[PDB]
Design a protein around this ligand. Sequence first.
Ligand SMILES: [Cl-]
Ligand SMILES: [Cl-]
Ligand SMILES: [Mg+2]
Ligand SMILES: [Mg+2]
Lengths: 227, 227, 12, 12
Amino acid sequence: GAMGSMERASLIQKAKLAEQAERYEDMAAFMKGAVEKGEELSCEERNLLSVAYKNVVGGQRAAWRVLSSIEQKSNGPEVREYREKVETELQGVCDTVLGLLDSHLIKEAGDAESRVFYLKMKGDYYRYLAEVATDKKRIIDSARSAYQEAMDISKKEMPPTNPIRLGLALNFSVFHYEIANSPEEAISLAKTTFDEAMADLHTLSEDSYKDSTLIMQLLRDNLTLWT
Amino acid sequence: GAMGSMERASLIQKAKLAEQAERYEDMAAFMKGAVEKGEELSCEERNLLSVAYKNVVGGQRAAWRVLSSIEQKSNGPEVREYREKVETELQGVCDTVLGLLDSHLIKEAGDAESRVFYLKMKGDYYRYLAEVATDKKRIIDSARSAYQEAMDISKKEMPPTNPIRLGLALNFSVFHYEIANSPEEAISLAKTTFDEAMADLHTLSEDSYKDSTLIMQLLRDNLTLWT
Amino acid sequence: KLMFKTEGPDSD
Amino acid sequence: KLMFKTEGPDSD
Ligand SMILES: [Cl-]
Ligand SMILES: [Cl-]
Ligand SMILES: [Mg+2]
Ligand SMILES: [Mg+2]
């Protein structure tokens, strides 16, 4: 694509600059270009990819909810038209990310840390598609399938305090609660995840402890509202 | 352009929705399309135009300053290249706004409230060009000329508390201080503007009083840092 | 809408 | 950079 002529290293450098400038669409385009070079991504690079698209789609999700709320209150074509415009752009971003994961990040991810990261991402962006879907069922089952594969690997290959495993469990629990309409599964998953992490904190350095307890706080935040 | 097929009223409605969604690039594109319908803009519509582009260019200015700061500290080509990319996009937005003002908002603006508003905008977007310019002198004199014409009209046709006149004086004073390197002109302009507004507040309703004193506070904020 | 906590940038 | 107050959205 348009980043085909730029060095991989230069794309990564500019992704970092774009993050500093809060230019997240640029950041995402640079990391898309980096992925398309065909090499596997390092841990830092995966997180740049995720941060970039999370910020882009986050703005779209927030705009879509504003517009959807206005639309529902109003129930001329303008509100529906503009909600559809934003919705279509959001779906395009999700399709772009899913395309990168399928071509070919997931299949080339051999390690648990990379494969779980990408499968979690796959669940996340199917979940964002599900938020606006009205094929709804198949989108939901695609999210479920990706999250479940990531969960299975993470339980076999990672300690219960691993931040990737924790963020996965967090997001899968939210999927259960409000996408799958399975609130008891969501609560059970969040509780067990928090408890098993807590029992493993004693093995961690201070820095790893800070990483893990940050995500555990998010599990507890949700549980407080769910119970 | 791409908005040529949408009704003027629908573009204005969608500009308002985009503002609610914090989708300012969309907001600007809708208002560009509205302007290009060829009718004069109402007061509310002028403010939609201004709000949209102010938010777009504001993000670009903030990104440009981050990148410029990194560039100067670092003095490979990547920092300069990406700063240039953002700079070129910023200049494109400024050129777009100046094109709308020149074709043909200013020449069709008969009233003081509209003509001063547009001439202030012209000064503002030449000032944003000046912030990144290294033709620098002619850009600065274009900003000065636009601000000065707006000032002359505003002093003849508007009361000293008029919010448009006040925001004009505010921005022209900042132009003086840090673009024209005329800090004493900036201080004098801000002081006289504040004093003459203060002496006219007694003529205002509570609502107009709130409007005027909001901008007067900005004049005083700057004066506090300049003196 | 009430958004629950999910991983990473609370960008929405 | 220290940005002084100008009219309207403090968007930068
Ligand atoms: Cl639309
Ligand atoms: Cl670039
Ligand atoms: Mg959120
Ligand atoms: Mg500012």
